[PDB]
Amino acid sequence: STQVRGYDFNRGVNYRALLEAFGTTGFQATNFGRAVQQVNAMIEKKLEPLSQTQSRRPLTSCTIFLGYTSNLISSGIRETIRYLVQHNMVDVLVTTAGGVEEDLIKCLAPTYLGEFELRENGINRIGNLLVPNENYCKFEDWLMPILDQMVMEQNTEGVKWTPSKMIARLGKEINNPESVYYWAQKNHIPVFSPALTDGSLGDMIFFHSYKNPGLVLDIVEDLRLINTQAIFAKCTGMIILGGGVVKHHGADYAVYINTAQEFDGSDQPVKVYADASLVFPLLVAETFAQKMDAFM
Amino acid sequence: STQVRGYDFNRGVNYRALLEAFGTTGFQATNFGRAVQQVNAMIEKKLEPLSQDEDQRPLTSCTIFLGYTSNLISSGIRETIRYLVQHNMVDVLVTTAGGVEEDLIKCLAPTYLGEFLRENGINRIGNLLVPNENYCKFEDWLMPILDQMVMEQNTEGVKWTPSKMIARLGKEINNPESVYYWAQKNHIPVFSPALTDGSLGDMIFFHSYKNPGLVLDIVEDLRLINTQAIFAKCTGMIILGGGVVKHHGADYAVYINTAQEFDGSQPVKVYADASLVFPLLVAETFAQKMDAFM
Amino acid sequence: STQVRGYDFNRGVNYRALLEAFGTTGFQATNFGRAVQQVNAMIEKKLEPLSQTQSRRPLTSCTIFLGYTSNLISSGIRETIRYLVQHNMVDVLVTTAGGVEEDLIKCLAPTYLGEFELRENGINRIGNLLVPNENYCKFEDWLMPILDQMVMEQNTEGVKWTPSKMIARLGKEINNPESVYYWAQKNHIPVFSPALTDGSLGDMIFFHSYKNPGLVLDIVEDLRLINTQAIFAKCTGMIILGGGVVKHHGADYAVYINTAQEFDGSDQPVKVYADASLVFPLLVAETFAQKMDAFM
Amino acid sequence: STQVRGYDFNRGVNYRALLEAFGTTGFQATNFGRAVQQVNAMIEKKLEPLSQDEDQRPLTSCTIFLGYTSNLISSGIRETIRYLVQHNMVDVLVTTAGGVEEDLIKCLAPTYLGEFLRENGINRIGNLLVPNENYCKFEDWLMPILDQMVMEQNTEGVKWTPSKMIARLGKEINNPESVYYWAQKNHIPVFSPALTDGSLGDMIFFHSYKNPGLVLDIVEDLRLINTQAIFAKCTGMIILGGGVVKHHGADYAVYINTAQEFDGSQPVKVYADASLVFPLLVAETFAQKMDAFM
Ligand SMILES: NC[C@@H](c1ccccc1)N1CCc2c(-c3cccnc3)csc2C1=O
Ligand SMILES: NC[C@@H](c1ccccc1)N1CCc2c(-c3cccnc3)csc2C1=O
Ligand SMILES: NC[C@@H](c1ccccc1)N1CCc2c(-c3cccnc3)csc2C1=O
Numbered sequence A, C: 001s002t003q004v005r006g007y008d009f010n011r012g013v014n015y016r017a018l019l020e021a022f023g024t025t026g027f028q029a030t031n032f033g034r035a036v037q038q039v040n041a042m043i044e045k046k047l048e049p050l051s052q053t054q055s056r057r058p059l060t061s062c063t064i065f066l067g068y069t070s071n072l073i074s075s076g077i078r079e080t081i082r083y084l085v086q087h088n089m090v091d092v093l094v095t096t097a098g099g100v101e102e103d104l105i106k107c108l109a110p111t112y113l114g115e116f117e118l119r120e121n122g123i124n125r126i127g128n129l130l131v132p133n134e135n136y137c138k139f140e141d142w143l144m145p146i147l148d149q150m151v152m153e154q155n156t157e158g159v160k161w162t163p164s165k166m167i168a169r170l171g172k173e174i175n176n177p178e179s180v181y182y183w184a185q186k187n188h189i190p191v192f193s194p195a196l197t198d199g200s201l202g203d204m205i206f207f208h209s210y211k212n213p214g215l216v217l218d219i220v221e222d223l224r225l226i227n228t229q230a231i232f233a234k235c236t237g238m239i240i241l242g243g244g245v246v247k248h249h250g251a252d253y254a255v256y257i258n259t260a261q262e263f264d265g266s267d268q269p270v271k272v273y274a275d276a277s278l279v280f281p282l283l284v285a286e287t288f289a290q291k292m293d294a295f296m
Numbered sequence B, D: 001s002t003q004v005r006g007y008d009f010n011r012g013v014n015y016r017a018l019l020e021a022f023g024t025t026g027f028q029a030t031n032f033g034r035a036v037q038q039v040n041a042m043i044e045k046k047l048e049p050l051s052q053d054e055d056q057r058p059l060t061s062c063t064i065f066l067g068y069t070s071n072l073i074s075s076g077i078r079e080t081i082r083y084l085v086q087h088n089m090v091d092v093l094v095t096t097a098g099g100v101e102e103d104l105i106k107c108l109a110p111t112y113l114g115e116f117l118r119e120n121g122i123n124r125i126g127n128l129l130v131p132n133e134n135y136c137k138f139e140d141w142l143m144p145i146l147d148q149m150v151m152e153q154n155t156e157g158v159k160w161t162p163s164k165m166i167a168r169l170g171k172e173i174n175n176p177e178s179v180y181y182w183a184q185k186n187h188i189p190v191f192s193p194a195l196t197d198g199s200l201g202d203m204i205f206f207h208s209y210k211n212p213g214l215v216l217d218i219v220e221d222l223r224l225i226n227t228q229a230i231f232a233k234c235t236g237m238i239i240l241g242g243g244v245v246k247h248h249g250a251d252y253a254v255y256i257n258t259a260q261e262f263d264g265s266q267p268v269k270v271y272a273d274a275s276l277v278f279p280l281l282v283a284e285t286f287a288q289k290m291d292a293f294m
């Protein structure tokens, strides 16, 4: 029986103690507290020594899957995710349509803050974020010669492209330390996204295919890669931001952060019903970023 | 302007007048009234003969895309979607992970109502219950088909994509209750790049160790879905449940979901569970023009 | 074990059968089906003969409380609620701030449909509804002489005003068969609303009190009235639209229709998670309106 | 304009920089950054001395109204609210049914964490658990006070309103953990016309048969709350949880709730559970200026 009790500001302001007190505050603050515990248990299992997939990445004592929706990549959470990937704190990335190109585009031009007329200035609104159309034009220019090389390598060097191999290539090509995908390919963290071509990147692949036909993207090889990662893990952890990212039907540790409801049936595990833009950086602050020394 | 006024039940229970009166009721009832008009405009456009200049599955005056999340296929809305597809009322289907297998499995065994399990072997989707045995029955049915598909790839040069696989599964289920049976029979393509994210995917995965090499290309499906939009005279969209399609326009569009805008996740949005709204929408729109589609 | 099955439009369009099939469709459609059952069981218990509070209203075999938020009174649901009250199908009304005056004002001037600049034309927006400010001005003019009479009767005829007695008086004064509150006082259905003065009606009572001081509105007498209604019922039914209307901590039958979530802890019973503007008229169509003959 | 950029944890865990960076992070993080600015503007205004012309519980340069739903008083946010009230950082409280008694009951017995009962005697509020015995303890404490209040009404001519009752309950609880103890001690009025809708109301009801005639007038409270706004130099509002106050303006305003607009139920709205957000907001605003309020 733990008693409900909030942080007492008559102590002054200690941010560690403030965040610890969320555990006893109730409602989603308590879920936040439980999420910190689950992620710290993931991390501690990951750091336990081993003494013991078609993948280069060395096995650890806990394989952590980080899933996220595109919109979080458009947000500043992109920096949070990049940090984790940069320091090898997760093992596999999963995302949805848009989630690749929104990272790469931010390397060529910035996304801006607006609010919750726009079409005439040439601007794509995503919540309270603004991406000028010019950004997609710059990305297109950058992308075309890479797709040319990709088709050539497929037809002459036997390369069998999948979304994950394409995402590694694009990460390598962007060659920029602010990119999630640059760091992911550098650290051999595979990125999975069958819905890679559903949005803007798809549109460009589509037009490119009439200029230079031939590109094939197989999803069955990626299917084998992602599932083998899970089957041959000693333990698995999952952290999933935004929902609609991953399917069930076991994970040893699981945290979900989203604002989706269960009532229209839309797809000790912990859910925090909150905007990940608020919650994820706090969660990282109290977990992965506390163990920064151990990952180096 | 138009005055707010609900239906007056002193007039008795006149269902058509009641549904019409939603338009002036306000909030999401008003949006439902607008959805009805939007869908009726699509249908009117569709039934319009192509003029001499507009000429080109045969193209109509309005190409209608129907998108839905897999949860709706688990629900009884599966029957509503099947009705529209059976009667050629839509031209293209788009769905999400689970959206295919959940239709096929219901031909082999029923889904049940529970409430809002792991030991009895039950998969819970909201208040719906699918016994785990349903998926075992599906596995048995599917494996021989996957053998045939790999054989045809390797010896007949068939290049599989998700749409072609879904067409083939529909032909193989050969059951008039199935959405996918009717889609392939009527040459309505089904697009679903996340086809392998769920249980069907687990099965294709395991199958690939006994009999490797199946390739599912998404790029040919990318070209097919986009060309449907590009060569349409007019386009209509009806998207149920959210997370199905991406923008960056349709001439007519209706979205029905309870997704929020605040975390960043004349078109009409109805903020409601599609399980309530979509059959009412269909009753006032497609079902009124049933004979025109026969 | 009931099997999931939707309405089959190859039968054509039978609206009764369509609505019955919601029961087996799943998700909130199934909850809708369960709500129809609960309300029909309320009604059937109400119609059972008796052979057996400080209130004139005769006891029946089930006392039905109908609760609703103001916004539903601004909507066309006002007509649905009025119908029930007109035909004595419920016994007690409960509402929130705004819920009284939005009915009365619609008797003097209409509310309009807008969408989800407005201040300069003089317009109060409520979701996609528009109420011109002029409507509140007309209501104020109408209200002042009634408040004058009310203060006089308090100080000379011993009248002890409560929100429910005030609401009866206003219903009687509006004298219009489109008003919920006209019908409620005519049929001796009490209306409870401690938060009666939180909005526009309150503002006007506030200004009036400097022109004609003295008005007292006691909530303790109303507290006694509403609770005695419940204590001395043979059976109770509750139908509550919009949430935040009533408090718990027993009802024999209960239906709630709202879109509030349980996750931030905001306050066989059935919940339908839906906009009552869609759901309530359908529910009425399949329940109270089917038994219209028996209530006359 | 401002570029989207999250906090970079390569800089280490610098909490102040992290909270500041929410402003450029986007979605509701950006709204949190705007709430911080809005509340800091209120506080800055409040600490501004009244000029010679502006002169008139003593009035300040900004009158701040703090509103909250009772669920927040059941939560640990009760401590946060109590802190602000204890230190005269707000001028008026407004709450909803349950909002009073749930503070008072915690002085007699604790609330507990459970998960998202009727036989053990437990009231469930989300993932919070209040044993039914807590309310029995509250009843015992309250009855003698209700006797005194009726006596003073009838023999001393006291005219009770909810605010006066809440002040009196706060004085009687005489406990520094209580929001209402500090409100009456600092002459912060508490308004709550729905005071009797819940458990306190059940108790006043039963008490009224043994000892009848208590009158709680809301009209005098109506005048008091409105006059606080009318005579303010500047007004600020902080409203947690929704359904608390009605409009038809404040100079500064922040709302924190997860209510939707679609059913119809420079001000800033943060769409989030206040149990996460409000203590962070307070840490960056009122708690930085603690000494100015002492
Ligand atoms: N059902 C198993 C489940 C899972 C989750 C986590 C670890 C292991 C297994 N799963 C595997 C397949 C998958 C794909 C995907 C990607 C590229 C090609 N094909 C499919 C995207 S999401 C998703 C998914 O959820
Ligand atoms: N961005 C354009 C947009 C669109 C929608 C509707 C008509 C035209 C164009 N689009 C096209 C591609 C697509 C796929 C998909 C399917 C199979 C392979 N690759 C991709 C699933 S959803 C989706 C989508 O939203
Ligand atoms: N807790 C008992 C509960 C209840 C509900 C239903 C039937 C009986 C009892 N209750 C009674 C009191 C009440 C008031 C109110 C109204 C005018 C004056 N004072 C209080 C508004 S809502 C509300 C409420 O929920």
Ligand SMILES: NC[C@@H](c1ccccc1)N1CCc2c(-c3cccnc3)csc2C1=O
Pocket: C197, C198, C199, C200, C202, C203, D065, D094, D191, D192, D193, D218, D219, D221, D222, D225, D226, D229, D244, D245, D246, D247
């Ligand atoms: N409509 C004006 C609005 C307002 C808010 C803030 C400052 C000024 C004015 N208002 C004033 C009245 C009020 C009551 C209340 C309390 C005790 C007795 N009667 C009514 C509770 S909430 C509420 C409210 O919202």
